[PDB]
Amino acid sequence: STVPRLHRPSLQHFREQFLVPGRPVILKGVADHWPCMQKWSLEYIQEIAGCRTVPVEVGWSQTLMTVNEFISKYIVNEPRDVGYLAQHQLFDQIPELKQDISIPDYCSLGDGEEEEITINAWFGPQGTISPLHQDPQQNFLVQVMGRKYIRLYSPQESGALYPHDTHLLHNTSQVDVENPDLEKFPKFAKAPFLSCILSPGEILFIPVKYWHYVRALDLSFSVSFWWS
Numbered sequence: 001s002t003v004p005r006l007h008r009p010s011l012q013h014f015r016e017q018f019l020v021p022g023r024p025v026i027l028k029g030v031a032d033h034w035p036c037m038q039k040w041s042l043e044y045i046q047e048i049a050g051c052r053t054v055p056v057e058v059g060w061s062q063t064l065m066t067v068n069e070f071i072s073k074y075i076v077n078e079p080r081d082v083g084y085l086a087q088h089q090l091f092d093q094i095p096e097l098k099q100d101i102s103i104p105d106y107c108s109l110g111d112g113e114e115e116e117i118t119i120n121a122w123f124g125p126q127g128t129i130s131p132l133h134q135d136p137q138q139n140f141l142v143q144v145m146g147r148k149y150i151r152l153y154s155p156q157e158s159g160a161l162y163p164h165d166t167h168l169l170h171n172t173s174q175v176d177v178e179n180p181d182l183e184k185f186p187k188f189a190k191a192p193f194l195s196c197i198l199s200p201g202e203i204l205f206i207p208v209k210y211w212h213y214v215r216a217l218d219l220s221f222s223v224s225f226w227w228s
């Protein structure tokens with residue numbers, strides 16, 4: 001089915017119908033007027049961040065380059081390979097940018113301290129893919145630029161997702177969601193799921209341990225908040 005979209009639900013409604021039972025939802029009307037939504041053009045990103053070093057996932061390999069280099073080589077003109085400025089705490093590195101986002105009020109329903117929320121940037125061209133995996137905290141994934149196709153499988157379906165057997169990769173599925181090898185992974189075909197296209201100004205709540213797969217449909221910038 002499709003992930004439900006709710007306009008500014010109350011704290012109590014979010015807590016009781018989504019957070020506690022662990023059900024995904026898209027929050028509308030919450031981040032849609034954060035400054036980032038209008039300010040973060042490529043040129044703005046170059047002006048504020050261009051000379052800073054960032055980690056870039058290529059393909060598979062992990063490298064380092066400036067933001068200006070990342071934009072030149074992997075975004076504009078005609079890139080040779082897929083590169084993704086993924087899972088990077090850009091807002092700790094560049095506090096000016098932190099002024100363009102906010103901590104969602106819903107995070108205060110958690111048990112953790114605000115100081116310990118991890119804020120990551122996800123900036124890349126059309127076609128970046130984060131394979132199906134699960135994380136150990138709650139997440140608000142805020143879409144700023146472009147759209148993402150997202151598939152969500154409940155932790156109750158873990159047996160059908162064939163996690164990798166190493167402790168290191170045990171949080172990641174062996175299956176390629178959009179082209180699954182059903183000869184090797186036959187249980188995957190019948191596993192139920194939710195999906196959405198997440199658009200600018202929308203927030204996706206990914207419950208703790210919910211399996212998620214993400215493909216960028218356009219040049220994309222997302223900001224995740226990992227919280228408890």
Ligand SMILES: O=C(O)CC[C@H](O)C(=O)O
Pocket residue numbers: 122128129130135139141212214215222224
């Ligand atoms: O947006 C992506 O490509 C991955 C999002 C990530 O898995 C998260 O935990 O926020």
Ligand SMILES: [Mn+2]
Pocket residue numbers: 133134135212
């Ligand atoms: Mn994740």
